Each structure stands twice: as structure tokens, then as C-alpha cells.
Amino acid sequence: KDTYGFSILDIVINNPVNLTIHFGGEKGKRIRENYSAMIFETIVDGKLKTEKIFKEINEHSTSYTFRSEKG
Amino acid sequence: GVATSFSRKKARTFDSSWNWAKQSLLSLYFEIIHGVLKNVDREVVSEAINIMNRSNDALIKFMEYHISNTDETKGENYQLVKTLGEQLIENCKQVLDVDPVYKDVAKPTGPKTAIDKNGNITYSEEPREKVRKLSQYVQEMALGGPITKESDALDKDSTKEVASLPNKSTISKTVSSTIPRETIPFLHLRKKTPAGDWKYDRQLSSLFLDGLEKAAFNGVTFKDKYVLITGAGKGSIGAEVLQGLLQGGAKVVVTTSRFSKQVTDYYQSIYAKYGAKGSTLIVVPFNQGSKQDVEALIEFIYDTEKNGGLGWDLDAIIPFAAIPEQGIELEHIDSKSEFAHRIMLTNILRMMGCVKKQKSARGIETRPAQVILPMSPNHGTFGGDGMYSESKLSLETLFNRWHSESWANQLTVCGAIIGWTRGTGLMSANNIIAEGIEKMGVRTFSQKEMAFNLLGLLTPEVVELCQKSPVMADLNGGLQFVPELKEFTAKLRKELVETSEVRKAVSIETALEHKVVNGNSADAAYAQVEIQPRANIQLDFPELKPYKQVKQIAPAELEGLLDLERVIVVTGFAEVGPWGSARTRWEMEAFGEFSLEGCVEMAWIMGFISYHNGNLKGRPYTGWVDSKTKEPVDDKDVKAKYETSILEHSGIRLIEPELFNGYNPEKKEMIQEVIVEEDLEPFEASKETAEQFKHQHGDKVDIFEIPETGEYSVKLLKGATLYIPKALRFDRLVAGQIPTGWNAKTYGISDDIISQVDPITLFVLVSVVEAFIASGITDPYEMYKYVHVSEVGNCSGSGMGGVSALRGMFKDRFKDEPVQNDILQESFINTMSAWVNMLLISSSGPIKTPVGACATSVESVDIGVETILSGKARICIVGGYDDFQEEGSFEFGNMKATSNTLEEFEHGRTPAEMSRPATTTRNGFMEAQGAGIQIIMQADLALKMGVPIYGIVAMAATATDKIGRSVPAPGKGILTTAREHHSSVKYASPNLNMKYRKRQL
Amino acid sequence: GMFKDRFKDEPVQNDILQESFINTMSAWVNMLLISSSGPIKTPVGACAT
Amino acid sequence: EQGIELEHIDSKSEFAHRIMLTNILRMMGCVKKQKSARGIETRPAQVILPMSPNHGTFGGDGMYSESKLSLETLFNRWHSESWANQLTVCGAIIGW
Amino acid sequence: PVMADLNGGLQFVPELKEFTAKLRKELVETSEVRKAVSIETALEHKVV
Amino acid sequence: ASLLLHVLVAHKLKKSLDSIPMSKTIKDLVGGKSTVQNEILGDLGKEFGTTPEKPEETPLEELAETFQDTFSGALGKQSSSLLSRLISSKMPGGFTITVARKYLQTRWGLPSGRQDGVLLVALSNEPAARLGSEADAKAFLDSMAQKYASIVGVDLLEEITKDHKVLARQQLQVLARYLKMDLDNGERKFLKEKDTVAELQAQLDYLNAELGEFFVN
Amino acid sequence: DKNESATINEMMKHLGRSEGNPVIGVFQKFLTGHPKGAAGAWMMNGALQILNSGIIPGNRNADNVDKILEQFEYVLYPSKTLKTDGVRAVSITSFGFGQKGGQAIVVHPDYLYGAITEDRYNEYVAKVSAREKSAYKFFHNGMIY
């Protein structure tokens, strides 16, 4: 809840089809920069390159959707 | 006034924007061909953008076929469509897969009070001098003016302007720097200083104006924005904020208070014009001064689709609704101002107080809802507002309470301070002083400008800024800088009131002097003679083009190729329906309103007006005369006297019992068999009837003879069977009926026949006679000067046809009412075509009668064309007819075929709104009454008679579906008229080519 | 069943109007038999049908 | 009114909006109809309205803040309506 | 019209709400932390 | 709920209570006639209210399972109309459903909730025509109380004054008819007055609901 | 409604339209109601008014066209009167109880007068014109008396 904006109990109890995270006020903004910190390094032959997992989450994104067919 | 109006089944969602762009583009297609709209018009630019907002892959393929098919040789307008059209096919392919955009285009207007020399005041909204844009309105609002001192291609080329629509404007001259130092803009946001007041901030307002400029160049987007807005009636700000929400893709609830058909046809027309791709629109009925509706509407929005709600969320709530208070001062503050304190203040707090309990339950705290409160600058400064001032002042306290209470995460307040919007129901009463208040430097806004200024409070620059601190938008043109706004208000009025009188009463005297110095009869020849129109009801035959013009349409090889004996042709047609004949139905169908020649026919149909010749009160008269009171009515006044009553009693309406022999739909009589439990009173009867009771009841009833009178006395004993009537409230209350007062006597049908024949044949004889009138046949025996007698067919049957003479036989003999002795004759389906041959045509052609039970008339055309092509008939009637009665209507009701009527009142539907083909919430059909026939004929003989050829029936077919166990279930059996073989689609058949068939001939 | 047995309020079917038409005896010839898509032009002659 | 916030604004705060605001307007609105009948226009009645400094600044007042803010509008309406001779407003802002 | 503002300077304190709950939560806790400590040293005193 | 669902399906198909197995579904019973399918849903949406998500496809042993959670010991709306029209067309004169409950209790020893089920077994096996004799009605009801016991599994002087108090009750009407006095004018003024009481409560409790009990009091 | 839209789309698709030429679907039962004998004739009088005038009238109760009906790209559903410059042929489809369906098609009358010759056409025009004036006189007199 406090870092990514979803509750894991509601996912298990009643299996959703889609889950749009919303990025609202201060709490929402705090949550979004936890999605903006998804860069993985590999110490490239003496370098450091980070690729963001979540592509479109930028400083203007008000939401993000997780999608699935069944659940 | 507190009484509830909301319900869950009275919502109307509007979601078919994928078809109001194929409609709106083809509506722009012919208004450029025929010359309605031209290259100058900014509305075509406005209608360009409402199609660029709705761009699918299927829509460009619609556009590409219609522009590539128009032929430029014929006209100059045909070249014009292909210039704009290929320019708009250019633009839609770039905005495809791009979110839609609100961009208001039209000319920003201004006020003008002009007083005529006769002393009449007129307020006219005039296009302004140096502000021809919304991009010029932005640079005006950033300059301020004199009183704030403290600290294109459009009208000359649409097709160039239409090209400049996808392209986003690239600038760097920032309008924040266009603000003069020591000059407040006209549109400034505010900031609370730590002393506690709200003062003008440069940087907050500069972030507002700069994004407001981009809102004029590029425009706002509102995709996935969910908005509540109340108080959105016609001609107010809430209707112009609505157009800017729907245009950008928002998903908007709009609540109305006066829920009608007029209101719901207006909200359909808004969405059929502005609603972009993905936008939606809900109209729910509403009360805001009711506590139980603000509870019940916020439930219905957030609640899920499994339980009937919407399942939505909300990202803006705009509670604008207000009632007028005027002339109401502090001693006259009463229940009207106390009902209106609750609309504008303490139920706005329960909208903001009840969306938070919907986000508390669902745990939603990362999606605020920006509240947009309408505020005022004048708190007590006008005269008797009532309690308008008190309500507005209270709203300002919310800014502080966002910091201090627990609802800062669900709601964010954004108070707007709307200036002089003129036209809206609060400030439309004084438009005449708006021109004088602008003489200072104060600015007034039309509604599309405070639409523009409030939709700048939803841009993603200021939406983020609301979520840090409250946002106060002061949108006055400097209307807080005029000293004594009340004193200067009445000063401008009393000058323009007196000049409107002193220029009026002076001009009325110099015309009274002028008729004394020179008299009346010297100037009596200086008035003119006007003329009122008369009604000239025409038959509307087809207008024939010259033979040079005709062969330009048809191919050149058709001449001599085509045998005219075996081409079938409609020669006449007529009908009788709920809107009278075929002529007064087309005026209601095509136009929605009657002409002057249709109010005259619909009054002659329903028997309102009535031709008088002779003397009226001694002096001679010739003209239309009311048939009730025998007093004259002019054709100029047939409308205003009778347009109400003709629209009351024609069309789909409530079932009127006088038309259907005492049938009340609400009281449907039924008899229930009971058993007597003791013996009844002796009633006296005649000899033959009391012997009939004894043969029936046997040993139960008791008949005895009365000695003096000679008539028997009948006693019932315990164990006999009675039939006591009951009555069943029945659901189906509405049917489309031939208008109230349609008499067959007014067409010339005698009482020898009306009293003897079925009511459905009176529908047919009027429809056969009027069909020769449309055919030029004035004497039905003119058909025999050319055709033999045994070559005039009559192939025209009904679905049920004679329902009124089946209850004469199954229901009125059993009741033993006085019935005719030949009712079985008049009940057949082939006997409505007997009175067409007994009272009319005396021919000996075929009389093949169809029955289709809902398709009786396309089958009848099929039997017709098949009859003529074999030469069995050279003329034949075709047509179909059916009568509406009580018992057929009840039995379609048990089949769930016709629609229930009490379900429809619960949805808020009106009777002129319940027959709806291809609709999302259609429910069944609406059973109607009447007839309709056509007279077909060879195309060889139609040229030799000299008759109006109205059409060419190229094809007629019928088809049966397949195996099943359900009769009313339709099927695709008539899909076998397109049957051809596609094994060999390589090379063109010469047989379908027409030059080849000419060479063989 | 429709003019006389509803008025008596006997137990009647709910789809008697279906089964009373003249073009529905030719429906059960296409519902229980032949499954074709040819013409279904129905005559009425009242003694010369 | 205490413990009452914007989602708990209910009939208790709606009964009390009427005590503190829109029946104070009917005291000042009904003494003027008693001086209208008797023709008394050379004897005003100084109204003493209790005001507050805190309009929303405390926590859940209920609608105490709304009632107080509305009273401030009267100062302007003395200049603009027709009851300036029978009533004179004197708003006091009482502290702690 | 006459507007009497009779505050002792209560419009010059920034964040009157924040400073209100600050003074209370100190005097509430000191009323408890001086209470529950004194209730234990009387429970120790009846054990030793 | 198995005892009520089995009757209302067997009425709409007009077949016996044994010729329809409850292991089958609604769809395999009709034949394809979709006029009948809407009639089966409407009779069950009225009767129980809670209609499942796939009624037409689920077998009837699983649908009485669903209906049992929200049905207990009631008669209902659809069920009380089919059982009063049963007596009003198949039972003799003076033999109302009150007499059909006095007979099932006195002779067969059946209280109120049991004999609500005896009438349901008598619904699907209704006569083809009206029973004529007064005892042939009782022979019909004796025959159905044992066809009800094969479902549940349970084995099973004041008339000298009733024909007297008839005479005094019928003498009373003929004196009241002679005096032209109305013995029911009290009740008709009564019954048309509880309408106006309940109408005012509808108006008055509307305002305690709008304005609240704190405001109004 | 679903069946009629589906049948029209299927036939047009099979025969080879152009993609982007949908037939415009007029509806008349919104205003008069659905009769059952008179149904195909009221649709037949309507077609010969849409042919000669070139006016496409509109279903003025289609507040929201159904979402299922978007899969038929060869139909269009209007809600307002749409006066065109020429309608060449109109379809008239009537579906009945007892699996009685059927369609007609009604070509413009000016395609008849291309197979005619100029002696014949001029002669025909005069006769029709005389008939038109004569019929007009007859209709007014009867109407009034």
C-alpha cells in the first residue's frame, strides 16, 4: 500500500481483471517515484546503465494500468 | 420544493459517438453543395474540429469514397467540396490515434445597447473590434487595461484554416512576460499571504495564463476525466462548460431539474455535435435542494454496474445550480430564499461530504476530485439579492477547512470567481447596462468566454497546483476596482430608461401634431396594404425535366433496349394513418412541423374547420369556418387556433376510449364464473326467454307463470352458475391512432355503407379513392378506355382485417347484443377488396388476396408484379390495411410483443418517445391503425394514359426462414436475394455489360 | 381463445394470436418439414381459397 | 457543534445554521416591519452581531464557520438596501 | 457600519490549528507520563 | 424450496409432478419454444426474487439449492394466485380455500405450513373440469394428502347451532333491509380513512427523512 | 433490430459495395407506430417521397444507437432530416410473423425516361400535364363539398 499503491489481500480474495494505479496528491506522487526508481544496473564492462522497467511513467503520468485476460 | 425527483431508471446515457460523425460529415456534405455554407464560415471550421475529434479507421474510408465520387464538371460547388474534403481527409489521418481536443473557434462577441428614435431598447451581441480570436482574448486578459494600475486564415479561407488544425503551435514569446509590470491581468489566480488575506500573485497567475494560451492554440484534453456538473440548463455557463467537457473527451454527469422530452432532445443534440471519441454524457433528473437526491446520486455514480450504478469515479465536481431571487430584501427574506440557501450552500456541502464517504469505503486516496465552486465578487454590494450573498460568502470558508479537516485527500477545492457573464439566468435581466459598465475598463464576458475561463481551471498545470494548496481564481475584468458599483449601476440604467421614454413620448406627440395640422385622411393614403396568405393544397406530382436533361442521367444504350411492357410502375398512392394522409405525414416526418397547407388539411381531416358558402349574418361568405361554433377562421389563423389541438390528438398518444367503442385500457372487463350459495330473488321474464333459462340451467333454475300479466317469473336456486363481471387493470395504454375526429363522412361516404360495413373498409375506400387522385384518375372508369375490364386486378389483403367483426360474432352474440345478421361477410380479409369493386372499379381482373400478418404489403406488391408480367392484369391495386381493437392489443401483450406502458413511465418516457427503432433501450413496438394502397401499372400503359409515374418497382420478394419452434422469431430468409456465385470472379461477364446487350438486340 | 376464452377468463395459452393467423398453418409446414426459402405468398378466398 | 466534519454535516448542523444565521436575518427583518408600520425612522436599532476570527481555521466546527462568514455581508447591504434607517449593524469580533 | 475586532492579536499567529494541537498533546502526555510513572513506583514500593 | 419449484415448473409445462425429473434443466424441457422460456423466468423472478446468473442452463436440483438460502415457509406472490384460481374454477359452491384448510387439518392432522404443501401437490394434478358434489371435493383432497406424504415422509355438536345461528343472522339482514339502515356504513367510513392516515404518514415521514429528526423535533 | 441490420450488412457485403458507402437507414415507425397490415405500404409511400424530393428523414427518437450495431459498417443510422441531391434507389424490407420476410427496391423514375424517345416523351409530358391540372381541380372541389 505505502510504496506501490495496491493491497495484496484484495488481489487474492476477489481476482481483478485490470488494476489501474492512480497517482493523486502527495501520497500519489510519493507512490509514482517508487515506480520511477525501477532501473537495473549490470556494471557494463566498467559502466553503469539503468533501464526503467515501467516505460511511460514520467513526471506527468497520473496513472498506470496492470492488465491480464483472466486475472 | 424539497420534493424528490431523482430516480435510477430515469438516467439517459449517450454513447453512440461512432455514428454522429458519419452523420455530421454527410450533413456538412450537402450544405456545401446546395450553397448553405460557404468558404467564409467559421462554423465549418468548428464543424471540422468535431470530426477531427472523432477519427476512426472506418471514418476516413467513409470520407475517401464521398470525396472521390463527386463530379466537378457539373457545378462550382462540386469543386468546393473536394477542396475542403481532401483537406479534411488530410487532417484526420494525423489526429487518428491522438486524444481529442477542446478548441473554441467562434468570434468573441461584445455588448451593444442601441435605442431607436421611436424609443425602443434593443440588446444586440456584436462581434468585437480587435479581438477576433480566443488567442486575441488571451493577450487582452494579460494586458489588464487602464484601471488596473496597482501591483489567421479564418474569415477568408476555411480550407487553409482547416489545414492548420492538426499542427501544434510552436512559440517562445511567453504571455507571462506580456503582463505589464504594476498591472493585474484580467484573469488572475490568487495566493494567501501569511497575514491571512488573499492577494494577487504574479507567478501563480502566469502559470494560469500561459497554459490558457496553449488552450487556445493547441487546446485542452480531457480524456479519462470524470466530471460531475449540476445546473447545466440551456443558455447558461453550465451548458457551455458542458460543450467544452464533451468536446475534449470527458465523461460527464449532467443533472437536470425540468426533465421532459424537450430537454432530452436538447441533450441528444449536444452529444450528436460535440461529443468526441470516448466521451460520454448522462442526463439524470435531479433536485439539489433535496437531501435525499444528493445522497442518491453520488451512490448511483460510484455504485457498480452489477447493481445498476455507473461504476465510475470523479475527478471534478461542479455544483452550479441556483434559482432566481430578485426583489427580495431583508424584511422579505422568506421561504423562497430559505429554500435557495440550501441549494447553493448546504447541499453543496453534502455533495463534497458524500463523495468522501464513497472514497472512504473504496479506500481511494490517490485520486482527488477538484471541486469547482462558483463564487461572486459582490457580497451585499447589489441591492436585494435575497440571500444570494450569504450563500456565496460561506463557500470561501472551505479553503481554510481543507488545511484543517480530514478530507484533504479526497477533495481539493478550486474556487472560481466568475465575473459578468451576460445571458445567463442570473445576469440576463440586465444586459442593457453592460455596454456602459465597459466604458470604465471593466470587462464583461459572454458565456463561451467564461466557458473558456473555467475550463482553464481543469488544465493539468492547475490541476496539479490544486493538489498542493487551494486555488482561488478571480476572473473579473477589474470589476472590483470601480467605486460604488451599486450607485454606478442605477446611474447607467436611469439614463437609458429615461432616454428610452423621452425619445418615445416626444415622437408620439409630433405624430399627433402631424395629424392635426394636416388631418388624418391626407395621410390615410400613406399607409400600405398587406396580404395574408391563403392555403393552396397541392397534389405534389413529380417535376418533369426536359428530354435533354433526362438522358444525361440514364445510359444512352437504354433507348430501345428495354421493353416497357414488362417494367412495373407505381402510378398512385394514398394512406390513412395516425397523421392523416400521405401528405400530412411527410410534413411531420421530414420536417417535424406542419406548413400552412398542412394545418389546413389536418383541420379538414379531424373536422375542425369546415367550408361555408352562402350568408354569414346577412353578408355573403366563402371560406373556412369553425365547425363547432360556425364562426369564421382565416387560413392565417388556422395555425394559432388549432395547432395545439391537432398536436394533442394525432400520432402516438394515449388510447382514447371514444374511438374504440368504450374501451378503457385501465378498465378491461372480464366475467368470472361463480356458484350461488343461496337462492336469488325472483325476476320476471318473458315466455321465450324464461324457457331458454330452463333448458340451460335444468333443474336448478325455476320458472313459473304469472297469472294476470302472462309473463313468467324466474327464480335461481342454490347450485347455479353466474358470471359476475370484474375488471383488470391492463398495462398497454398507448397506441398510434387515426386522429380524433377522423370521420369517413367528411370524404363523402354515405350512411348506407358506414352503418353496414366494417371500420377497416372505411380506411380502405378513403385510401383507394385518394390513390387515384394522386394518379390523375378522376373517374375510375377512365381505366377502361385503354384496358379491358377483365384486365384490372385487385390484389390487396390484410394481416387480421376485421377484428371489429369477429367480436361481433364471438363476443357480441354470446352477450346477445343486437348485432347485424351478416357480420361474417364483413369480417373476411378478401372483403375489404370487395367494397373497392362494389363501390368503385367494376372490373373482372384477378382478386388474389395476400395475408402476411406483419408483412402483408410487400407480399402484396410481389403478387402484384407477378400478376402484371404474365399479362393477367394491366392495372392492379396493391396495398394492405389493419384495424386496431381491444382484444388484439391484449393478446400481443401476453406475447411480450408490444411494449409495456407502465415500465416506460417509470423510465420517464413520454408517449411521443416510445416507438424507437435501433435504440440501446428499445423494449417493443407500438401497434397502430389504418391503411395504405398503391396502384401499379405497366410502364407501357402509363405513358399511353398520361399518368404520374412515381417509381419503378424493380424487385419484390418474399422468403421463409427455416426449422424452428418459435413463430415470432425473425430470420435471414430474405438474405437469398443477393445470391450469386463467386467461383469465377476473374473476368467480366459481357452479359452484365450493357453495350453488349444492345449489340445483340 | 382470444375473444371468448379471455373474457370468460379460462386458462388459455399466452400465444394464441400466433396460432390464429392464416399464414401460420404454412409456418408449421416450414418449421416441422421443408426448410426452404422460397415464396410464402398466402391466399384468402373465403370459399375459393 | 463538535466532532462534526464535512462528511458528518447533518441535521444538527442544519438546525444550527438557522439559529445563528437565517433567523438572525428575520429578527433584523422583522423589527423593520414594526418600524415601517409605526413610521419610526428617527430611532435606529444597533444590531450587535457576534463574529469570529476563525472561518474554517479550527477543525470540525460543523457549520459554525459558514454561519459566521455570512454575517459579514450585512455591512455592505446596509449601504445598498432600504433598511439603513431602522437598523444599523455593529459587528463585534469576539476573541478568546 | 462599525466592525469591532476584539482579538488580542489572535490573527497574527501562523498556523493556529497546528499550534493548538501542539500545546494540547504536550499537556495531555505530561498528564499521563507523570501519572503512569507514579503508579509504578507505588507498585514497586508495595513489593520491596 | 424443492417442493415449491417442482410445482411451478410442472404447471407451466402442464405436465405431472412425476414426468419431469429435477436433474434436468429448463432448456431441455421446452423444445425450443422461446415464448415459454420467458414465462418460466417471470414466474420464478416473482416468486423468489433472487434469480441466479444462469437459470435457463442450470439443472433444477441445483436451483432449489440456490432458492433455499432465501426462502423459508412463505406462500409468496405467484404461488398464492395459482392456488386461489384453482379453488375458483375446480371446487364446488361454498367450498372456498378456507374450507380446504379446515378439512386437511381436522381429518388428516395437518397444521398450517404442512397443508400449504398439500395444495401445491393438488395444483399439478388439477381436475379437467369442476367437481360437482360436495363429497367429491373431499375425495379429491383425501387423494392428494397421501400423494403429499410420499414426498415429505409423514404417516397420518356445534353443527346444531350453526344452522340455528344462520337463521338469526339471516333474520337480522331482512330487518335491516326493512329499516333501510346500512350495517356496513361504519366500516366503509373506516376503511376509506386508514387511506388518509397512511397518506399523511407518507407525507409526514418524508419530512423527517428529508429534514431530519433533529431539525423537526 | 439486430436481425434487420445484420441481413442488410450481409447482402451488401457479399455483392461488393465500396468500403465507405453505407446505406442510410430511415425509420418511419418512430412517428406513426408499427401497423401490421399497413406496414409495408407506409414504407412504400415513404420511398416514393424520398425518391422525388431527395429528402432523407430522420428517426427523431434515436437518442443512442445501439453499441452492437457498430459491427455493421455497411449501415448508417441518422436522427435528422438530410436533404440530398438525388436518391437513386430505396430499399424496403418487411419482416413478419410466421417467418414472412421480404424486400423491395424502388428505382428513380428518371431511369424510365431514358429508354423513351423524344417524340414519345414530349407527347407524354403534355398528357400528364393536362391530367395534373385536371386532377387538381377535382381534388379541391371534392375536399370542400
Ligand SMILES: NC(=O)C1=CN([C@@H]2O[C@H](COP(=O)(O)OP(=O)(O)OC[C@H]3O[C@@H](n4cnc5c(N)ncnc54)[C@H](OP(=O)(O)O)[C@@H]3O)[C@@H](O)[C@H]2O)C=CC1
Ligand atoms: N452567471 C453569473 O454571472 C455568475 C454566476 N455565478 C454563480 O454561477 C452559477 C452560474 O449559474 P448560471 O448558469 O449563471 O445561472 P442559471 O440560473 O442559468 O443556472 C443554474 C441552474 O440551476 C438549475 N436549478 C435551478 N433550481 C434548481 C434546483 N432547485 N435544484 C436543482 N437545480 C436547479 C437550473 O437549470 P435546470 O434546472 O434546467 O438544470 C439553472 O440553469 C450560479 O451558481 C451562480 O450563483 C457566480 C458568479 C457569476
